[PDB]
Amino acid sequence: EIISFQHLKRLTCLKLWHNKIVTIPPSITHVKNLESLYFSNNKLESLPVAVFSLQKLRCLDVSYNNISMIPIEIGLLQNLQHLHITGNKVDILPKQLFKCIKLRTLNLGQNCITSLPEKVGQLSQLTQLELKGNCFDRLPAQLGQCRMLKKSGLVVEDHLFDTLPLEVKEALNQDI
Amino acid sequence: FGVFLSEVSENKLREISLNHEWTFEKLRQHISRNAQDKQELHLFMLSGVPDAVFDLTDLDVLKLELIPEAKIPAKISQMTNLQELHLCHCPAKVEQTAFSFLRDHLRCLHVKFTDVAEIPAWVYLLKNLRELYLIGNLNSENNKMIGLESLRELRHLKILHVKSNLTKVPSNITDVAPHLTKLVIHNDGTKLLVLNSLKKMMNVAELELQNCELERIPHAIFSLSNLQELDLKSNNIRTIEEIISFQHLKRLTCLKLWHNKIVTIPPSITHVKNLESLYFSNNKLESLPVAVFSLQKLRCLDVSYNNISMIPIEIGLLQNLQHLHITGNKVDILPKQLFKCIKLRTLNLGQNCITSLPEKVGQLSQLTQLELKGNCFDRLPAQLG
Numbered sequence A: 001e002i003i004s005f006q007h008l009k010r011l012t013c014l015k016l017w018h019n020k021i022v023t024i025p026p027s028i029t030h031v032k033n034l035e036s037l038y039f040s041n042n043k044l045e046s047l048p049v050a051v052f053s054l055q056k057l058r059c060l061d062v063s064y065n066n067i068s069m070i071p072i073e074i075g076l077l078q079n080l081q082h083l084h085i086t087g088n089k090v091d092i093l094p095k096q097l098f099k100c101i102k103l104r105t106l107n108l109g110q111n112c113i114t115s116l117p118e119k120v121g122q123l124s125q126l127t128q129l130e131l132k133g134n135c136f137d138r139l140p141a142q143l144g145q146c147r148m149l150k151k152s153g154l155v156v157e158d159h160l161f162d163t164l165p166l167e168v169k170e171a172l173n174q175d176i
Numbered sequence B: 001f002g003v004f005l006s007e008v009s010e011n012k013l014r015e016i017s018l019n020h021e022w023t024f025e026k027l028r029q030h031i032s033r034n035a036q037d038k039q040e041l042h043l044f045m046l047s048g049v050p051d052a053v054f055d056l057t058d059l060d061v062l063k064l065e066l067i068p069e070a071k072i073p074a075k076i077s078q079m080t081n082l083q084e085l086h087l088c089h090c091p092a093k094v095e096q097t098a099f100s101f102l103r104d105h106l107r108c109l110h111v112k113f114t115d116v117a118e119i120p121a122w123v124y125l126l127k128n129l130r131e132l133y134l135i136g137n138l139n140s141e142n143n144k145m146i147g148l149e150s151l152r153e154l155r156h157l158k159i160l161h162v163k164s165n166l167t168k169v170p171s172n173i174t175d176v177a178p179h180l181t182k183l184v185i186h187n188d189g190t191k192l193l194v195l196n197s198l199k200k201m202m203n204v205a206e207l208e209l210q211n212c213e214l215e216r217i218p219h220a221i222f223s224l225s226n227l228q229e230l231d232l233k234s235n236n237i238r239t240i241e242e243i244i245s246f247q248h249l250k251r252l253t254c255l256k257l258w259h260n261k262i263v264t265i266p267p268s269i270t271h272v273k274n275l276e277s278l279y280f281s282n283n284k285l286e287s288l289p290v291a292v293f294s295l296q297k298l299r300c301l302d303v304s305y306n307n308i309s310m311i312p313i314e315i316g317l318l319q320n321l322q323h324l325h326i327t328g329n330k331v332d333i334l335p336k337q338l339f340k341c342i343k344l345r346t347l348n349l350g351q352n353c354i355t356s357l358p359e360k361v362g363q364l365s366q367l368t369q370l371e372l373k374g375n376c377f378d379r380l381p382a383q384l385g
Helices: A002-007 A026-030 A118-122 A141-145 A168-174 B007-020 B099-104 B149-153 B196-200 B244-248 B359-363
Strands: A013-015 A036-038 A105-107 A128-130 B061-065 B084-088 B159-162 B182-185 B206-209 B346-348 B369-371
Touching: A002 A026, A118 A141, A141 A168
Parallel strands: A013 A036, A105 A128, B061 B084, B159 B182, B182 B206, B346 B369
Antiparallel strands: none
């Protein structure tokens, strides 16, 4: 009962997994000091829509799930850090994460993504972006603007090391 | 005296001995590999496993080959940087208290090289696997039944891989699983395949049906919308299939097939506009391929292992090609437009005793890999320099 959580407003890192989570309630406004939430072993398809009320979160509760998007709360996340958006099917990803810079882990399995715009080349504070399962053969130029970050999940082969020998080759060769 | 006949009492001494001489000083100096630190150990000789091997903290992969025994306690819960484990002709049926940290953190394996009776079962039901390596396992149609609901259901399952069996459908009703992205199978015997796969496995980015005897490609493969394959290596592909389904699937980006019987390709190869990497070999061709100069995205020239007397005037296509490969021919002439491209990195033209090179090779100053065999090799001009 989240009216009790209105008096328990200092739950800063709520964590709970290995459970029967159907969905999350909309009253998660009632915890302002919350700065990180992460779950696992949850069954869903609908999007968590009450996330933009809480401005402080740095982790997402999105492992062992079934999801098709990241929701419209993307415009207000700035101080966030962790995205283990894993167990999904989506190709599109919204062009929003050039605004937020503090996020450092895109631990995103199961996404055969196609495009990675300026949002992937803007985040200097990031250093990690996991992906397995991909076309991995579009390989955009914004990855050339990624020398501040170091390592991705699977992309380091000669498919990216033969496209664009001036941007990404000089990037991932001056980095090491 | 009757003590020394009982074999379990001798198993006691071999277990105490193999715990004895594998100290930390001996075992921890043995670890060596480059990408991941695989603990090799002579496990065919090791009848019982050691346990001081669990006292090593930078070990993330290791291999088990020909064990009689089964020992792995929850002691390796502490060194939970492990993500995959090789087991081959190897059971380990001790696993109740240790099931949870391998259920979560371990996501991959090499469970190959068994029969169809001694098959580990816990690997079926730990819900967080990503890549399966199940080869050398002679899966008959009574052995199709061992593919059950949990590996049908589970989350992260990237790939699986099957080799050298009588199999034609190991478990393709698994296809509701959300990460089938590379399905690779070996040693087909027939041309039969199940229709449930392509309309429910909506997510394969690769497929490698090596060592088949088909000439068929699934024409109904249009449902899966992000695919970069057609691979049927080691197959007599006589004439290729209906390509307007490949016009629907214009997102074919890495099409490659060889050890084949390609006569010619129809001009529907223009239809895959998003095709950047393409390499063939081992096919009989002398004719000039027609529609090849429409593939603007290209990076490789799929003309390996076929003779050519006159290469076509199609090098006005190659703005951004990256690799040559042209092998087994006799030609001495090449047109001028190769100074258009600066993108290529391999002069890869085997078996051409060509005369010399024009000014266009001075285009490719940043190039570092040149390949030929046989030349006039007497001019060798300064545009190479």
